[PDB]
Symmetry: D3
Subunit: 143 residues, 6 copies
């Protein structure tokens, strides 16, 4: 809606350095969808180990980035449960298509499928220059 | 029937700190299986951010650890392709049951399902346990050789 | 009884990258403590000790033992509402075998003497890896 | 000639956590260079500048531009087979806007004189100037 | 008349790994400040600048002086209850000698002009290693924010 | 000038970041003694953890700092044994007198006692004041 910067992401997510993988939330509509973006700089602690010969953002950290963007969605959609500590329950149908490299802007959109009580299921996609880098059919989450 | 120590691991996998998650390979049968373990300590760089109120090993790092073990199996199963930089192509059927906490040993088995010299296309299943109970299942991991 | 990592941080002030007790698996107040440290290649100190070969620094096997000793002192007698304990002295440290990534360091400390509200405690300590003695400490002295 | 990071580390000696150029998009030898720095929350410095509010250190934006300058000098003339370039002096540094996480800092350095070399530099975030550096002086050593 | 690291943390918001003042050995309000930064090989920036040879970044030397300047400003006049000082501009920076591991970066910053009205302060800065000048800075402009 | 700078220390000791704790050797007499200094800054990875509430250099890191200085000594005393990885075999008579804080210069001296298993003694000063005593360090 209005844009929501980092200082306010740290108020929603319990995550911190080196494991906060969302820089900005550019569009969020509660109970439907969220769009955020992660900047990929060589100046991140994980590159030095993946890999020294060739820096490629771990596929698992692109899941984690989406999974955190998905989290921001759930915790703004309903905060009657005042517990920001969400855990990944299950993930299904992850497909990585293109490497994500330093200097790239990872643009990510996750979409809610169902909510209950928590037990929430979301879909996720990430793009670098309008090309699909990673698909996630279903991310499940629990309190 | 040898245990493989860390220095030899670092000769197989191109992974370094802070993203190498195999501490030891304790069992490995080429073209078939692999069993190793990751030691979970409070003194790993990720636990400060996940989370400061409660320390829990990020389930994706478990995926990575299993993937890295799977990775080991592939490269000691067939290294005509002298390229160690493997990339995750897809993961499927991931269920996390139990939290992995500091002090735990994460024992991991991954099983090769299919391998094709075609492109470096290998499919693998995997389980992660802490104290004989299942903490993670992975139905299918797909990897591509560069 | 059984002290998990979250409860460890409530007792000790130690934080990353210098908190070297992952679990306390047996404790008896004013007598003994058994805890454990998981040695993984994913610790910041391994990159610098050493690149060619990874061996857990001997001084960190002391500190770990010293932190587990501290825990015992603080649970044994907490009339002194001060958690910041300082190393006073250490005596008769012998390293026998290397501690490597993949290893579980089993540690036990035994309280020898405590002088109440003077903060002067003395303890012994032994660390194990697969039933094998990897570090011995004759005497750790602490100041509250 | 566009340059990715792997090749950047072949030109610059800078490494983690003090390599502040992620890509080189345009490079004209002896004339101009344009590159970008991705400002993400997952950088080591942000934890300390500041806890309460995250703002890229102005000194690092200079540094980012400085290395951008450094590459340009090296790919202009490398009969000096010495990649170690030192900051000899900086002038006319003006910070207009803070740089925050999630920003793309775009950078253009211009060579002025090479004998010892002199360069100007500008940094953009969404077409808007966030930093001006009139003169960066460098000494090969 | 010397303020140690715990107190520096009460004045400055800067934290690890971007706090670059270890001690303030002399400070006179509205006029001058003298402090020192200890250069150790066990600093996280050394690994990247550079692997082949360890040299404390010219830019960080700026930061350290600026930070020392920062302290001076905050203890000169604290009616503006705001410790987040931002660098507005820096002028006439000349680096003379490399600062190496093992060196004690002794620093002096001197206030020139302050307009309480706005939140704008101007300071010169000098750094010495063994009484030898390593860094000159003619002007460091700051904005209270 | 009897000194050793960091770039030369790194050729003698294998140790690297974040566990190299000797910034400079200032004096060295083979088979007798060695003087070195470690700079203690707030910009060191360990201070964030020990402690957050009050920054004090771990007693153990003062041992290691003196140990590494003692390690440089044995290696330059006699490098017929072409092996730089020295292991601390034991340590005895460690007493810590004063807290070492950020801002301090840790001035260390180690002295060779016996070489066959090498034994050495160690002292650390902070502004002439004695902060650490090590009766005996054993090396293998
Ligand atoms: O998970 C990994 C790293 C591995 O190869 C392994 F084996 F460690 F899992 C990864 C997967 C996909 C990409 N990608 O395409 O961006 C990058 C890295
Ligand atoms: O403190 C060290 C590191 C060193 O080698 C040196 F040189 F730094 F002292 C150490 C001490 C004891 C063992 N051990 O248990 O065998 C291994 C390493
Ligand atoms: Cl302690
Ligand atoms: Cl530079
Ligand atoms: Cl500042």
């Amino acid at each position: 809606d209005t844009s929501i910067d980092i200082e306010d992401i740290k108020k929603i997510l319990p995550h911190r350095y080196p494991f906060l993988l969302v820089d900005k939330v550019i569009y969020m509509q509660p109970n439907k969808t969220i769009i955020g973006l992660k900047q990929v700089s060589t100046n991140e602690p994980f590159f030095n180990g993946h890999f020294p010969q060739k820096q490629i953002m771990p596929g698992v950290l692109q899941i984690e980035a989406l999974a955190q963007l998905a989290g921001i969605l759930c915790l703004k959609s309903d905060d009657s449960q005042k517990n920001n500590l969400f855990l990944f329950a299950g993930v299904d149908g992850v497909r990585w298509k293109k490497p994500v490299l330093p200097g790239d802007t990872l643009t990510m959109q996750a979409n809610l499928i169902s909510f209950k009580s928590g037990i929430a299921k979301l879909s996720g996609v990430g793009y670098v220059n309008g090309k699909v880098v990673i698909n996630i059919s279903e991310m499940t989450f629990a309190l």
